[PDB]
Amino acid sequence: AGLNTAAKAKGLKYFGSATDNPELTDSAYVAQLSNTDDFGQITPGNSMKWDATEPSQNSFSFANGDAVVNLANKNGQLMRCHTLVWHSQLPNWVSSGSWTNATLLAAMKNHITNVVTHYKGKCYAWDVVNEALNEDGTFRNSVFYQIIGPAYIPIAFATAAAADPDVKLYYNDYNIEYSGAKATAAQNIVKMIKAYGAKIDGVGLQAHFIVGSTPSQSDLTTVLKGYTALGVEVAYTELDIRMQLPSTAAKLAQQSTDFQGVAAACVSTTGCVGVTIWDWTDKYSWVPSVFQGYGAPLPWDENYVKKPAYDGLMAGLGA
């Protein structure tokens, strides 16, 4: 029994984990990442982003993305492919370009087509557009929004669907897990894509939460159902629950209940297909370098030992 067996027993497609290429040289890490009792699905943390896959214009590079796919293939795990259009981790040629609408669109479409076609048949889902919203629900002023306007979003989805018509296409974002302007604006992106006549299959809720300040099971579920009502599926795509350090037994127990609610909200909502944690061990979490004074966010500690949050997750999944 483990997270992925329990998830599947409740009708979810998977419980999964992100990873990154340098971690695949750690034997012990790879052994646990490869334990399909716990993980039925993998997301590449960095090697399918634009700077990795198209470091110069029309010059694609897939070796590192492929290495993650190969590991999922060896294990029989599903892949989520992450991410086509995003304002972060762009190569210099995109950011520094003197663009027109026509020339940026051409570059964006060529990016999407190339990368999606390369991974055709290999991915459960793609995060097609990531983080397009500001917290108030207005559109983020990325290069894509400044040059192309809002149509970049549906154009991106239509391009992806043309290159691989079977893969689930997701809009992915953070702070759209709880009721508010940003979640309403995420519902509105789903509606906009469909009004354009483009395909969207899923909403990805990143779920980067904080211990003792995580949305309640009730509000998480209201929000999930807000998206599933629209005829899309949903998933928690980058779950982690960062704690203000130092770690204590009380914070670890809080963290357990916070993870428990997330799993339980997913099981509660028909059309929630899965949960991915953003890596699985505190040793390799992205959190401490970005969020000063915060850490210990995942269900295993830095020594690869289960924390109480593992049992929270199991409880939330009814195991």
Asked whether 225 and 179 are in contact (CB, 8 A), the reply is: no
Is residue 264 near ligand NAG by the rule CB under 6 A? no
Q: Nearer Cβ to ligand NAG, position 95 or 101?
A: 101
Q: How far apart are the first and last CA of the chain?
A: 8
Shortest distance in whole angstroms from residue 187 CB to ligand NAG: 22
**Backbone interruptions in the chain following residues (C to N > 2.5 Å):** none
Structure-token pair, residue 49: 């982003």
Q: Nearer Cβ to ligand NAG, position 22 or 149?
A: 149
Active site residue 131: yes
HEC sequence for 67-131: HHHHHHHHHCCEEEEEEEECCCCCCHHHHCCCCCHHHHHHHHHHHHHHHHHHCCCCCCEEEEEEC
Shortest distance in whole angstroms from residue 149 CB to ligand NAG: 4
Shortest distance in whole angstroms from residue 147 CB to ligand NAG: 7
Is residue 149 near ligand NAG by the rule CB under 6 A? yes
- Judged by CB under 6 A, which stretch of 145-153, 282-290, 291-299, 305-313 contacts ligand NAG? 145-153
Q: Nearer Cβ to ligand NAG, position 55 or 149?
A: 149
Q: Nearer Cβ to ligand NAG, position 101 or 138?
A: 101
Q: Nearer Cβ to ligand NAG, position 69 or 148?
A: 148
Q: Cα Rg for the chain, rounded, in angstroms?
A: 19
Alpha helix stretches (DSSP H) within 199-307:
217-228, 249-268, 287-290
Distances (CA, A) of 92 to 57, 103, 145: 10, 16, 17
Total binding residues toward ligand NAG, as defined by CB under 6 A: 5
Out of 81, 129, 148, 186, name the contact with ligand NAG by CB under 6 A: 148
Out of 101, 103, 213, 218, name the contact with ligand NAG by CB under 6 A: 101
Chain-centroid distance of CA 165 in Å reads 20
Out of 107, 151, 181, 210, name the contact with ligand NAG by CB under 6 A: 151
Active site residue 238: yes
Alpha helix stretches (DSSP H) within 164-248:
181-196, 217-228
Name the residues that contact ligand NAG, by CB under 6 A. Answer: 101, 105, 148-149, 151
Which sequence positions are flagged as catalytic? 131, 238
